[PDB]
């Protein structure tokens, strides 16, 4: 919500441009370190030029402190239902004999089911022998054969992506506003770097990092939510455990293709001469998803999901001190037009001093066009960066002070004409 707080000046060693047809253009190519703001504070960059009003800002807003989980191994799973097909045949009839049902293979295509066709789904064939003679339908006393063709098929319309985590990485959500106004929403973690159209960003220095999640397995449910399960990650699929049928995508689970992995002897068969009752002991993950669901408090930490984006987030009581870097890979910034004038006013000043929270300043800006109002003191120690619009709009940010009785005369401007603005207020001592 507030504006910038930590403002730095761009050096001339990483800025080079010219002017063609009354069009001052600049280019950024280098690396500039900047201090990260607090919860809600912003960190912008001042980009000057050959005049005074030709100035564009590069703001970076910090949402809050988060403790994301470092993912690694994952697998898709869901619900499945078998489909068994019985076909009893007497002995010495085609391929239904004693020298075939004993050495029958699962991937061996049966001749009796040869009219089924080729399918890319999980299927299996068996040959359960039965009693012969004239009491059940056989011209010989040899035991009859039972051709079984069972294929798995899905009954649900969604899948779950079960993943784990071995370390907790401190993640910071940053909403970066560029020079022209192209807003973006990214995030950083430990030493990660995001590639943006203007270059890249990376977390320079942090001061938060916990560990303790090897005995926890998370379940991802896109469109509904997440889930927490208190068990180690399933590496080997087996019958009777959460995660017996794994795949690689959601469509592979909804279609039950043969490209996934499964455990042998999973489908149970109960033949009754002519009947065939084959069922499976599949563990429904929706039950555990209904039981355990984020947010959940484990030991002394609060686990939850993310706001908008997909990902697990852990909340606690971290620090706030952090450093950031800015990499410019030769970006061009133009400024054809020019900014207009605008008057500023003082509304209120509520906050603190000598603390990371700062002081919340509230001002009133009255202008006629879209511009960028900026104020500065006399000794060159504090700066005010506030975007101006058309009409009368109030703008407040977070400032830093060291004395309780704040009373300083500032100089605000929007196009090259500076005007005084005496501000005052009483703050509280917050460490």
């Amino acid at each position: 919500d507030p504006g910038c707080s930590e403002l730095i000046q761009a050096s001339s060693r990483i800025t080079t441009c010219s002017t063609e047809g009354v069009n001052t253009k600049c280019r950024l190519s280098g690396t500039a370190l900047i201090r990260a703001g607090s919860v809600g504070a912003e960190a912008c960059l001042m980009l000057k030029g050959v005049k005074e009003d030709q100035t564009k800002f590069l703001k970076i807003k910090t949402v809050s402190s988060e403790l994301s989980c470092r993912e690694g191994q994952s697998y898709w799973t869901g619900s499945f239902s078998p489909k068994c097909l019985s076909s009893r045949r007497c002995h010495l009839v085609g391929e239904c004999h004693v020298n075939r049902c004993l050495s029958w293979r699962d991937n061996e295509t049966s001749a009796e089911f040869s009219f089924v066709g080729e399918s890319t789904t999980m299927r299996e064939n068996k040959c359960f022998e039965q009693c012969g003679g004239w009491g059940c339908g056989c011209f010989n006393v040899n035991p009859s054969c039972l051709f079984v063709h069972t294929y798995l098929q899905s009954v649900r319309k969604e899948a779950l992506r079960v993943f784990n985590c071995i370390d907790w990485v401190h993640k910071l959500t940053l909403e970066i506003t560029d020079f022209d106004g192209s807003v973006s929403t990214i995030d950083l973690g430990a030493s990660s770097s995001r590639f943006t159209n203007w270059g890249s960003v990376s977390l320079s220095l942090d001061a938060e990092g916990i560990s303790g999640s090897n005995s926890f397995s998370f379940i991802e449910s896109p469109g509904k939510g997440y889930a927490i399960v208190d068990e180690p990650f399933s590496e080997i699929p087996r019958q009777g455990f959460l995660g017996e049928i794994r795949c690689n995508s959601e469509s592979s689970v909804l279609s039950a293709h043969e490209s996934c992995l499964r455990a042998p002897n999973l489908i149970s068969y109960k033949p009754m001469i002519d009947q065939l009752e084959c069922t499976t002991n599949l563990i429904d993950p929706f039950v555990v998803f209904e039981r355990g669901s984020l947010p959940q408090t484990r030991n002394d930490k609060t686990f939850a999901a993310s706001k908008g984006n997909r990902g697990v987030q852990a909340f606690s009581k971290g620090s706030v001190q952090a450093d950031l870097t800015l990499m410019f890979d030769n970006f061009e910034v133009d400024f054809v037009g020019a900014a207009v004038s605008c008057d500023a006013a003082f509304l209120n000043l509520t906050g603190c001093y000598s603390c990371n929270a700062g002081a919340r300043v509230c001002l009133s800006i009255t202008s006629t066009g879209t511009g960028s109002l900026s104020a500065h003191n006399k000794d060159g120690s504090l700066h005010i960066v506030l975007p101006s619009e058309n009409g009368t709009k109030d703008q407040c940010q977070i400032l830093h002070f060291t004395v309780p009785e704040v009373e300083e005369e500032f100089m605000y401007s929007c196009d090259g004409d500076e005007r005084p603005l005496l501000v005052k207020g009483t703050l509280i001592a917050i460490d």
Partner: protein, 301 residues
């Protein structure tokens, strides 16, 4: 195991009203002749269901044996405009007929025998839905489905199509759907009984039993090899017969064996018997089991 594919019990006829040009080599269907409506059923890689079930009766043999009725009209002409009773079901059925063919028979919703015919001298397309122009033509019909039946009189008019979670399939209207109806041409099983409509299926549970009817046994002679001998001239248990014939336990258990006094060796048909199906937990005797590639609209939303 036994090479008895062309041996057709019963009458063994393959001709329909309108395409009786192959009546010379189609009535009956012996080991010789070139019948266009029987060769494609023996090709490896086409219809293996008839290959595994050779000792049965096809749709045409069922019509000739007063089992399956004939539609009206029996031969739907593909020349008359403004449509004709034989398009709303043919257009929603993805088939594939080879070159040089005129008529094409298939099963309708009413359980009768349908067939499309092109006027001379036209032929069918790559799918058999429409007609087009082109050598000679195979005067006959091509099986569009993978069905079979047998001789029975089991009633089953109180059973309809179930298919849980399916909007509309083929030409029947199970329920009024309004959400996301997934449309995809897929194969669907079916087992039409007697005096019933096209009852679709989901899972197949077929059983085979040993039958004692004369239309389920063979009896060949050895001349100076093999020779087609009719089993109707065989004796009975305690009766009297004109000719003699021997066999094993399945043949001697129902007829009479004369040991060395016989002149023809008989045996059981490798792939016959009474084949029943399980419908709603009841083992009924079906009359038209097979697959057909039709439109499958499954409820997605």
């Amino acid at each position: 195991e036994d090479p008895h594919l062309r041996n057709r019990p019963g009458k063994g006829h393959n001709y329909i009203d309108g395409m009786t040009q192959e009546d010379a080599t189609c009535k009956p269907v012996t080991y010789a002749g070139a019948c266009s409506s029987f060769d494609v059923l023996l090709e490896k890689g086409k219809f293996p269901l008839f290959q595994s079930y050779a000792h049965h009766r096809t749709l045409l043999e069922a019509v000739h044996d007063t089992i399956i009725a004939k539609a009206d009209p029996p031969s739907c002409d593909l020349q008359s405009a403004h449509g004709n009773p034989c398009m709303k079901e043919k257009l929603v059925m993805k088939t594939h007929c080879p070159n040089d063919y005129q008529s094409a028979h298939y099963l309708n919703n009413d359980g009768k025998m349908a067939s499309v015919k092109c006027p001379p001298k036209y032929e069918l397309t790559e799918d058999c839905n429409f007609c087009r122009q082109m050598a000679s033509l195979k005067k006959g019909s091509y099986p569009l489905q993978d069905l079979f039946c047998q001789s029975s009189e089991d009633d089953g008019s109180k059973l309809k199509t179930k298919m849980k979670g399916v909007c509309e399939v083929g030409v029947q209207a199970l329920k009024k759907c309004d959400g996301q109806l997934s449309t995809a041409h897929e194969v669907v099983p079916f087992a039409v009984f007697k005096n019933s409509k096209k009852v679709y299926l989901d899972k197949l549970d077929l059983k085979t039993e040993e039958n004692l009817l004369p239309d389920s046994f063979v009896c060949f002679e050895h001349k100076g090899e093999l020779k087609s001998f009719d089993i109707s001239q065989c004796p009975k248990i305690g009766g009297h017969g004109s000719k003699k014939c021997t066999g094993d336990a399945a043949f001697c258990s129902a007829y009479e064996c004369t040991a060395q006094y016989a002149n023809a060796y008989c045996s059981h048909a490798n792939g016959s018997g009474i084949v029943q199906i399980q419908v709603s937990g009841v083992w009924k005797k079906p009359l038209c089991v097979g697959y057909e590639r039709v439109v499958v609209k499954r409820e997605l939303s």
